[PDB]
């Protein structure tokens, strides 16, 4: 399976995966391979926020899926 996640500087990132993977293996390989940590930012799908414990194809990502990113947010 190959996925994406759409930054908000208008950069496609490409990931290559198992349709079974763990979102924590997927959480892994993207700093691994390009170096985005959780520290600064936060990866959207369909309006959804996506966390540990699940899969890809529970969260229904599909094959070629693209991923909003956001930030992580500002204060104190």
């Given at each position: 399976m190959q996925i994406f996640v759409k930054t908000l500087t208008g950069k496609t990132i490409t990931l290559e995966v198992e349709p079974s993977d763990t979102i924590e293996n997927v959480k892994a390989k993207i700093q691994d391979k390009e170096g985005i940590p959780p520290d600064q930012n936060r990866l959207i799908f369909a309006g959804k926020q996506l966390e540990d414990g699940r899969t890809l194809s529970d969260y229904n990502i599909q094959?070629?899926?693209?991923l909003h990113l956001v930030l992580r947010l500002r204060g104190g």
């Open positions: 094959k070629e899926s693209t």
